[PDB]
Amino acid sequence: SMSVKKPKRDDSKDLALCSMILTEMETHEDAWPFLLPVNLKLVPGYKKVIKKPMDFSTIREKLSSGQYPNLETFALDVRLVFDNCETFNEDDSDIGRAGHNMRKYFEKKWTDTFK
Numbered sequence: 199s200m201s202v203k204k205p206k207r208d209d210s211k212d213l214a215l216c217s218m219i220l221t222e223m224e225t226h227e228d229a230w231p232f233l234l235p236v237n238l239k240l241v242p243g244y245k246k247v248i249k250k251p252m253d254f255s256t257i258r259e260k261l262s263s264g265q266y267p268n269l270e271t272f273a274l275d276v277r278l279v280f281d282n283c284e285t286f287n288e289d290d291s292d293i294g295r296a297g298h299n300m301r302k303y304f305e306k307k308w309t310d311t312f313k
Contacts, residue, residue: 212269216261219307223276224254226303228296232279248286252278269312276304 223229235253238245257275266272283297 209268213261215311216266216269216272219304219311220254220258220261220276222307223300223304224258226300228299229254231283231293231296232300244286248282250278250282252282254279273308277301280304 224233232254234255236244236251252275257272260266260275261272280297280301283293287294287297289298
């Protein structure tokens with residue numbers, strides 16, 4: 199509360215560390231469904247169904263331009279990528295499986311880096 203603060207967690211490396219995680223997600227072999235925005239002209243249903251499209255390239259631009267106020271808002275966008283993927287894709291599809299794998303990969307890196 200006013201004039202009463204928990205001890206200051208060092209957040210000065212968060213930007214660099216989120217960038218590193220993101221690089222690792224970008225270079226994973228199962229990243230291909232997620233690298234670029236879904237083409238809303240060419241994928242029927244996507245525009246109407248997925249209210250907040252997100253992809254690695256869009257996260258990378260947001261990261262690079264100071265549009266994440268803190269590491270939690272970064273993790274929300276990454277998770278949004280996977281939550282979108284589960285909303286639109288069957289579990290038993292290549293893309294559905296990609297999304298599960300990437301989410302797992304991300305969550306471990308997240309925990310190991312920050313928790």
